[PDB]
Amino acid sequence: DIVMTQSPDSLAVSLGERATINCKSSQSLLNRGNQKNYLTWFQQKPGQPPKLLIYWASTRESGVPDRFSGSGSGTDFTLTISSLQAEDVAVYYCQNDYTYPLTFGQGTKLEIKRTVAAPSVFIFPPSDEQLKSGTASVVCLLNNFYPREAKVQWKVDNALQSGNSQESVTEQDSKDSTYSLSSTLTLSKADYEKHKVYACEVTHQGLSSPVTKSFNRGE
Amino acid sequence: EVQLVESGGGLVKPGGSLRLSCAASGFTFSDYGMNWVRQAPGKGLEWIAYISSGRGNIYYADTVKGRFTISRDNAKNSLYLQMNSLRAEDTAVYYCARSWGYFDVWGQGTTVTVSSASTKGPSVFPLAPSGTAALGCLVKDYFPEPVTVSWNSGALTSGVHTFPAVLQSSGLYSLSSVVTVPSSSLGTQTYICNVNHKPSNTKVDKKVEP
């Protein structure tokens, strides 16, 4: 293999500013017979195949805006995205096209840097329909916050929970560049009906102190 | 217009086999080298197989050599991948890609899941709302991925968050889809989540009431 290493692994850049993604190859990508550096850049959004941006290290694919620019030679290559727009949020890959096996970099996630936004927090008790089947899922929703870093803790009758919750986070929102997050606490029905207070405690840069949303079972 | 379309992906047990197909149109298929590139859930792109135009030179990634075979039928403008001795690590979206010294045309992909677990459709539970309110649907205990969720048959899009599926310790997936709405909208609007789990042919419409 020629090993392809991108830097940084993730990047946050403000709207209208310049994003720089670096790619280093473990060996030369220069074709001695036609003088092209066979280094290729792709953009990939969730659920879609990758989109070709640049090939031969610096030639833009047809239809790619001129704010995308590829440069470099030898083993050091760079993708530059000027005047960043919300449509540019994506994972970017470099790739060895010089010799087989064709190898990709590990990808670089590019997001929009925006101002801090504290989440709105909501808590959902399990449905009576679910309880009947033997299981209780308690859901805590964090709505439209930035940055992505957040701490969500579950307390049941004021005792901190461990090992019985899982989190999922959306991609940056197209309109306001925020994230949303759900944390789901799973208990058996028998266990759930032994407790009264269910609380989701949220810590986030946008909040002066942690915010708790709670309910009492049966109320 | 140039098109590539993959098919054949599905659920298959470890040690099993599967043949993928890719059909091409809108260009002279026989003039181009053709490829399979795959992407495991949450991971990067991995090129795995190539067949050239004239000589039909064939190259494989070492991870699939001796197990997967690539072929083409130029009379049908078609590319194939015969996958044998499948392993859990072969779980991925498989793309067909045209190349001319770089991959310039991609299909939308076909998904292959290698697991011994059985297919199971989800249960759909309401997330009932209590000047912003939130409501949603919990889509629990399904296999394999994916499920799709829409609200009011696709008419409700603003304020929706459909979260990435999470793999539970049971080996089954779960996800929630929520929406925020003005609390006064709860009396003037009907909220229905439309859940589709094709691997199990499950289609559910759940009304969410306070």
Author numbering:
A (entry chain L): 1 to 219
B (entry chain H): 1 to 130, 137 to 216
Publication excerpt:
Engagement of CD40 by CD40L expressed on T cells results in the production of proinflammatory cytokines, induces T helper cell function, and promotes macrophage activation. Disruption of this signaling pathway has the potential to reduce production of proinflammatory cytokines, reduce T helper cell function, and inhibit macrophage activation, making it a very attractive therapeutic target for patients with chronic inflammatory disease.
A crystal structure of ABBV-323 Fab was solved to 1.74 Å resolution and the ABBV-323 Fab/CD40 complex structure was solved to 2.84 Å resolution. Mutation data supports this structural observation: a HCDR2 S56G residue change results in 20-fold improvement in binding affinity due to higher flexibility introduced by a glycine at this position.
